[PDB]
Design an enzyme around this catalytic site. Structure first.
Site, PDB file in Angstrom:
ATOM      1  N   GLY A 180      -9.343  19.017  -7.095  1.00 16.36           N
ATOM      2  CA  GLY A 180      -7.996  19.326  -7.525  1.00 16.36           C
ATOM      3  C   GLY A 180      -7.465  18.522  -8.699  1.00 16.36           C
ATOM      4  CG  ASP A 217     -10.012  10.249  -4.352  1.00 17.39           C
ATOM      5  OD1 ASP A 217      -9.704  11.413  -4.661  1.00 17.39           O
ATOM      6  OD2 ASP A 217      -9.193   9.299  -4.352  1.00 17.39           O
ATOM      7  NE  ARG A 241     -18.073  14.920 -12.202  1.00 10.67           N
ATOM      8  CZ  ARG A 241     -16.939  14.221 -12.201  1.00 10.67           C
ATOM      9  NH1 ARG A 241     -16.158  14.196 -11.125  1.00 10.67           N
ATOM     10  NH2 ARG A 241     -16.582  13.546 -13.285  1.00 10.67           N
ATOM     11  CB  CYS A 262       0.453  21.443  -4.997  1.00 11.94           C
ATOM     12  SG  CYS A 262       2.241  21.378  -4.776  1.00 11.94           S
ATOM     13  CB  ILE A 303       4.260  11.819 -10.911  1.00 12.79           C
ATOM     14  CG1 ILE A 303       3.183  12.869 -11.202  1.00 12.79           C
ATOM     15  CG2 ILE A 303       4.362  10.813 -12.046  1.00 12.79           C
ATOM     16  CD1 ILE A 303       3.434  13.704 -12.435  1.00 12.79           C
ATOM     17  CB  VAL A 335       1.047   7.206  -5.463  1.00 10.18           C
ATOM     18  CG1 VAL A 335       1.499   7.221  -4.019  1.00 10.18           C
ATOM     19  CG2 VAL A 335       0.706   8.614  -5.932  1.00 10.18           C
ATOM     20  CE1 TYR A 374      -4.286 -12.130  30.834  1.00  6.65           C
ATOM     21  CE2 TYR A 374      -6.622 -11.684  30.472  1.00  6.65           C
ATOM     22  CZ  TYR A 374      -5.290 -11.348  30.282  1.00  6.65           C
ATOM     23  OH  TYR A 374      -4.965 -10.234  29.537  1.00  6.65           O
ATOM     24  CB  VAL A 421      -1.789   1.466  25.263  1.00  6.08           C
ATOM     25  CG1 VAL A 421      -1.163   2.654  24.548  1.00  6.08           C
ATOM     26  CG2 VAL A 421      -2.664   1.965  26.402  1.00  6.08           C
TER      27      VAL A 421
HETATM   28  N1  LIG Z   1      -1.607  18.567   0.531  1.00  4.27           N
HETATM   29  C1  LIG Z   1      -0.748  17.919  -0.446  1.00  4.27           C
HETATM   30  N2  LIG Z   1      -0.252  18.634  -1.522  1.00  4.27           N
HETATM   31  C2  LIG Z   1       0.568  18.020  -2.452  1.00  4.27           C
HETATM   32  N3  LIG Z   1       0.966  16.716  -2.434  1.00  4.27           N
HETATM   33  C3  LIG Z   1       0.453  16.022  -1.335  1.00  4.27           C
HETATM   34  C4  LIG Z   1      -0.405  16.540  -0.302  1.00  4.27           C
HETATM   35  N4  LIG Z   1      -0.733  15.590   0.633  1.00  4.27           N
HETATM   36  C5  LIG Z   1      -0.079  14.552   0.149  1.00  4.27           C
HETATM   37  N5  LIG Z   1       0.655  14.701  -1.024  1.00  4.27           N
HETATM   38  C6  LIG Z   1       1.490  13.745  -1.805  1.00  4.27           C
HETATM   39  O1  LIG Z   1       0.764  13.248  -2.885  1.00  4.27           O
HETATM   40  C7  LIG Z   1       1.036  11.878  -3.115  1.00  4.27           C
HETATM   41  C8  LIG Z   1      -0.262  11.078  -3.210  1.00  4.27           C
HETATM   42  O2  LIG Z   1      -0.972  11.661  -4.273  1.00  4.27           O
HETATM   43  P1  LIG Z   1      -2.407  11.125  -4.700  1.00  4.27           P
HETATM   44  O3  LIG Z   1      -3.192  11.120  -3.446  1.00  4.27           O
HETATM   45  O4  LIG Z   1      -2.384   9.956  -5.601  1.00  4.27           O
HETATM   46  O5  LIG Z   1      -2.796  12.417  -5.696  1.00  4.27           O
HETATM   47  P2  LIG Z   1      -4.094  12.627  -6.517  1.00  4.27           P
HETATM   48  O6  LIG Z   1      -5.103  11.691  -5.972  1.00  4.27           O
HETATM   49  O7  LIG Z   1      -4.349  14.080  -6.279  1.00  4.27           O
HETATM   50  O8  LIG Z   1      -3.995  12.410  -8.081  1.00  4.27           O
HETATM   51  C9  LIG Z   1       2.011  11.430  -2.023  1.00  4.27           C
HETATM   52  O9  LIG Z   1       3.320  11.415  -2.565  1.00  4.27           O
HETATM   53  C10 LIG Z   1       1.891  12.522  -0.959  1.00  4.27           C
HETATM   54  O10 LIG Z   1       3.063  12.725  -0.140  1.00  4.27           O
HETATM   55  O1  LIG Z   2     -14.166  12.501 -12.600  1.00  3.04           O
HETATM   56  P1  LIG Z   2     -12.732  12.928 -12.635  1.00  3.04           P
HETATM   57  O2  LIG Z   2     -12.818  14.405 -12.331  1.00  3.04           O
HETATM   58  O3  LIG Z   2     -12.173  12.647 -13.982  1.00  3.04           O
HETATM   59  O4  LIG Z   2     -11.869  12.220 -11.467  1.00  3.04           O
HETATM   60  C1  LIG Z   2     -11.525  10.801 -11.361  1.00  3.04           C
HETATM   61  C2  LIG Z   2     -10.477  10.641 -12.437  1.00  3.04           C
HETATM   62  O5  LIG Z   2      -9.121  10.977 -12.033  1.00  3.04           O
HETATM   63  C3  LIG Z   2      -8.136   9.926 -12.097  1.00  3.04           C
HETATM   64  C4  LIG Z   2      -7.286  11.259 -12.484  1.00  3.04           C
HETATM   65  O6  LIG Z   2      -5.929  10.644 -12.872  1.00  3.04           O
HETATM   66  O7  LIG Z   2      -7.446   9.863 -10.861  1.00  3.04           O
HETATM   67  P2  LIG Z   2      -7.069   8.865  -9.886  1.00  3.04           P
HETATM   68  O8  LIG Z   2      -5.588   8.719  -9.727  1.00  3.04           O
HETATM   69  O9  LIG Z   2      -7.748   9.317  -8.601  1.00  3.04           O
HETATM   70  O10 LIG Z   2      -7.570   7.547 -10.304  1.00  3.04           O
HETATM   71  C5  LIG Z   2      -8.857   9.049 -13.076  1.00  3.04           C
HETATM   72  O11 LIG Z   2      -8.581   7.734 -12.885  1.00  3.04           O
HETATM   73  C6  LIG Z   2     -10.359   9.311 -13.050  1.00  3.04           C
HETATM   74  O12 LIG Z   2     -10.999   9.182 -14.303  1.00  3.04           O
HETATM   75  O1  LIG Z   3      -6.464  -7.021  25.966  1.00  2.63           O
HETATM   76  P1  LIG Z   3      -6.008  -8.245  26.642  1.00  2.63           P
HETATM   77  O2  LIG Z   3      -5.694  -9.408  25.583  1.00  2.63           O
HETATM   78  O3  LIG Z   3      -7.164  -8.750  27.626  1.00  2.63           O
HETATM   79  O4  LIG Z   3      -4.732  -8.031  27.542  1.00  2.63           O
HETATM   80  C1  LIG Z   3      -5.000  -6.971  28.450  1.00  2.63           C
HETATM   81  C2  LIG Z   3      -3.817  -6.922  29.412  1.00  2.63           C
HETATM   82  O5  LIG Z   3      -2.550  -6.781  28.796  1.00  2.63           O
HETATM   83  C3  LIG Z   3      -1.668  -6.281  29.818  1.00  2.63           C
HETATM   84  O6  LIG Z   3      -1.016  -5.089  29.383  1.00  2.63           O
HETATM   85  C4  LIG Z   3      -0.639  -7.352  30.139  1.00  2.63           C
HETATM   86  O7  LIG Z   3      -1.334  -8.531  30.529  1.00  2.63           O
HETATM   87  C5  LIG Z   3      -2.541  -6.051  31.092  1.00  2.63           C
HETATM   88  O8  LIG Z   3      -2.093  -4.973  31.911  1.00  2.63           O
HETATM   89  C6  LIG Z   3      -3.923  -5.834  30.443  1.00  2.63           C
HETATM   90  O9  LIG Z   3      -4.988  -5.992  31.374  1.00  2.63           O
END
Ligand SMILES: Nc1ncnc2c1ncn2[C@@H]1O[C@H](COP(=O)(O)OP(=O)(O)O)[C@@H](O)[C@H]1O
Ligand SMILES: O=P(O)(O)OC[C@H]1O[C@@](CO)(OP(=O)(O)O)[C@@H](O)[C@@H]1O
Ligand SMILES: O=P(O)(O)OC[C@H]1O[C@](O)(CO)[C@@H](O)[C@@H]1O
Ligand SMILES: Nc1ncnc2c1ncn2[C@@H]1O[C@H](COP(=O)(O)OP(=O)(O)O)[C@@H](O)[C@H]1O
Ligand SMILES: O=P(O)(O)OC[C@H]1O[C@@](CO)(OP(=O)(O)O)[C@@H](O)[C@@H]1O
Ligand SMILES: O=P(O)(O)OC[C@H]1O[C@](O)(CO)[C@@H](O)[C@@H]1O
EC number: 2.7.1.105
Lengths: 449, 449
Positions: free
Chosen positions: A37, A120, A128, A150, A160, A163, A329, A386
């Protein structure tokens, strides 16, 4: 027929009475995920998030951002001119950057134990992509494509600002210009951009085309379980703004006696925490809010204080300590000294006798995570272990550090979508409680000593 | 804050000291799933299977086949003439059949506790579909569409031979004619058939378009968790021929002492069963075969006998009896008489103290089921309760009967795809063992007695 149970994981394996000369051998094909993309389409976002999920569920994954390779080869960025299709020299460097990245991809999947590698880059041309297929083909790697489409200027513009402009490429630029330079950069890729065509040229490719930020999907020939999950995952994540709150049940009676597990109720302080939590939620002034608890009395009593509908989940129950439930423990070390020591040396994989391991929690929590991605505002009232697992997922923490993350009582962890991940804020509700956090903690088996 | 734990499910609920006059109230919108497509496209197949899955995971679902309503209103079928677009009278009957089915759909979702209703009919016109939307709209039902598209004559032809010709409509017909009459019937629907158009007319509809028997999918705006799962599910099921074998570990030591749970190894007979199983597998002469076991020694020893790579799954571990592990039913009745009685009166929902219920097994086995759908030949070596749950899914057995299904030791259950479901064959490997099957089993609390 004749086996022995491993001491840490409690897994039954066949006894290998390695003959005189024990032979080892070692080390399911690895997968190269190809992002596709125009820039500012969320490819990096998807890349990082998918990798976060996969590593969490146990599938070793890493992102290979070609952009970073370029910043590494060309110390400082100047402008979009670098990306012009007529920039013969820059094209060589870019090609070299991509091939260098693949090189590392090969080393990862074939020599470092990685299973998934996310390539990426824009990868906007059939040329490519065909190269990548060849690469994969010669290394015996499966290939899966994820294209993000998009054409909503408001979206691209926003992406833009969130990020791009704050990238190290624009260290010496103001918004106005970084934004203008990026738009020109995107134009550079537009002329030769050939989106995936599954109903024609790309029929044999395994891919998913994410359209209008997930509004619509086009999935073509999933190959395996791994490609099944990702697809499922990508269709459940969204980018709407929202907040996730995580906390433990108010302090309980077993907490006071230093007792693990069980199903004891709230102490007087734990109850106090409950009201405090109710006040906190009120002050957050959220339009809507889901409340989830485990099925242990502790979390439900806490939820009751809120006076809000809450849903119980058996999967959120605290880790099961097997024959050690309700034991201190101290009692564990005394009664099961070896079990105690075994857990301390491998806290993530260690499994309690007839109980669970942190590893089990992850498999158990996967569906809780999948739902959290689908929801908006959610308050999860749970347990230490958890909580650590969920937090590890959101904060991209490794399995090694997961069982040690600090998740104190009476404290709310506020998680917010920021940039490419989650921002975390801690809010202690000002109610005392015990501390249940525990950190990590030969000569005779050798001559001379 | 102040609650009480339910006796059967062990769930913590708040004590409702119902005031003088206890008020009850009662009884997430229900969903109407709309099947779309020409006949012989697998809509009924998908309908029945999806419903099988959903009910198993706990979402009450029922199929409403308009065809059956027609057979009910018109005692005997004659020919495709009934379906001609110019058959003004038949059109009235067909419309009446569809509206009668919706009527029952309303009664199901609004008065019988059902959550999902699958409207199974061709629903090949925008006009028919718009009617259904209206219906849903006025009853506050969500609407989800699943269209099956297949232009592969070999497929349609095959589908016809597998489930059509043997329909009660063709009771007095030979293959040659039933096949010819069905083809003409399909032609009747072809002229006014308007497939779903998400990138245009149906943009606002929540739907999935299954293409070329799952080869490709087009998903448009999933609304909830429920629509998320189904989609996931439909993208993992296939129709390739294959066999699923299910059996328990060879008899174990606890089996001999009448002891539940634990992690005992194979008895001499259990081991004998192991070899027998190895011989059975050999004779099945399967090109490929996956072997899955639990993590309990019992199933793994059995697998070892096969001399085939097998994968362990913690989810396949036998149900956890909590504080009753390793205890005999006699010891349970004596030590926990009330727990014993509680389990007998509600065996499916009953949960062992600090243990599980058959209900827990289902949630735990869901991912095992999802993988079984994705695979081809698979041998699952497990446990009684676990086996019952899986079998209940494949044979569409209710929760009420699940904990009583007969799943004897040393017996292999061979499951094969036949018609709209699974055919089961039992193969006892001729090795003795104990029988662990147990079937189901006032005056003073009233005056006069
Ligand atoms: N499926 C999507 N379509 C369009 N924008 C998206 C999608 N998923 C995430 N984003 C947005 O894109 C941004 C991150 O873009 P980034 O990953 O740097 O783009 P790219 O790598 O394509 O140049 C964030 O603001 C995020 O909310
Ligand atoms: O090989 P291509 O297709 O140019 O993709 C990676 C390129 O895209 C860029 C496109 O802006 O994106 P990125 O933000 O992922 O860093 C360039 O830094 C980089 O040269
Ligand atoms: O992962 P840890 O550090 O052993 O702690 C585990 C414990 O934590 C707790 O939620 C509280 O002690 C217990 O129920 C569980 O066994
Ligand atoms: N997605 C699909 N596309 C085409 N045929 C399918 C699909 N899913 C199942 N089938 C086949 O269709 C048959 C069942 O068809 P049925 O459900 O009676 O069709 P319909 O209800 O569309 O008239 C079975 O032979 C089955 O293998
Ligand atoms: O309302 P329509 O769209 O006709 O759909 C249901 C109809 O399809 C039939 C199409 O053959 O299929 P089915 O096999 O599902 O019974 C008829 O019995 C029935 O009249
Ligand atoms: O569901 P049931 O009829 O109580 O049998 C359950 C028992 O079956 C076994 O697999 C064998 O007795 C035990 O491990 C388990 O507790």
């Amino acid at each position: 027929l004749e086996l022995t149970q491993s001491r840490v994981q409690k897994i039954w394996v066949p006894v290998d009475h390695r003959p005189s000369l024990p032979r080892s051998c070692g080390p399911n094909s690895p997968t190269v995920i190809v992002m596709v993309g125009l820039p500012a389409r969320g490819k990096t976002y998807i890349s990082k998030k998918l990798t976060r999920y996969l590593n969490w569920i146990g599938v070793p994954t890493k992102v290979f951002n070609v952009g970073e390779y370029r910043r590494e080869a060309v110390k400082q960025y100047s402008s979009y001119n670098f990306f012009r299709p007529d920039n013969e020299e820059a094209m060589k460097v870019r090609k070299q950057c991509a091939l260098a990245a693949l090189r590392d991809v090969k080393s990862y999947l074939a020599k470092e134990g990685g299973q998934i590698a996310v390539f990426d880059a824009t990868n906007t041309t059939r040329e490519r992509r065909h190269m990548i297929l060849h690469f994969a083909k010669e290394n015996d790697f499966k290939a899966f494509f994820i294209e993000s489409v998009c054409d909503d200027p408001t979206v691209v513009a926003s992406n833009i600002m969130e990020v791009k402009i704050s990238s190290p490429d624009y260290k010496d630029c103001n918004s106005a210009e970084a934004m203008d330079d990026f738009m020109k950069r995107i134009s550079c890729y537009e002329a030769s951009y050939q989106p995936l065509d599954p109903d024609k040229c790309d029929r044999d490719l395994s891919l998913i085309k994410v359209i209008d930020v997930g509004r619509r999907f086009l999935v073509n020939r999933v190959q395996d379980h791994i490609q099944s999950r990702i697809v499922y995952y990508l269709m459940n994540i969204h980018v709407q703004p929202r907040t996730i709150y995580l906390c433990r049940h108010g302090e309980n009676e077993h907490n006071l006696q230093g007792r693990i597990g069980g199903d004891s109720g709230l102490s007087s302080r734990g109850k106090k925490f409950a009201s405090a939590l109710s006040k906190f939620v009120e002050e957050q002034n959220l339009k809507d809010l889901r409340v989830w608890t485990s099925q242990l009395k502790s979390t439900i009593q806490t939820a009751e204080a809120l006076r809000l509908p809450y849903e119980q989940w058996k999967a959120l129950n605290e880790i099961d300590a097997g024959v050690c439930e309700e034991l201190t423990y101290e009692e564990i070390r005394d009664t099961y000294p070896e079990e105690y020591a075994l857990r301390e040396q491998d806290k993530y994989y260690y499994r309690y006798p007839t109980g669970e391991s942190y590893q089990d929690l992850v498999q158990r929590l996967e569906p809780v995570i999948m739902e959290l991605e689908r929801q908006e505002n959610v308050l999860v009232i749970c347990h230490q272990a958890v909580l650590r697992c969920l937090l590890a997922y959101f904060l991209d923490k490794s399995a090694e550090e997961m069982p040690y993350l600090k998740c104190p009582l009476h404290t709310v962890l506020k998680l917010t979508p920021v940039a490419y991940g989650c921002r975390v804020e801690s809010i202690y509700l000002n109610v005392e409680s015990v501390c249940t956090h525990r950190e990590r903690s030969n000569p005779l088996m050798r001559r001379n000593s």
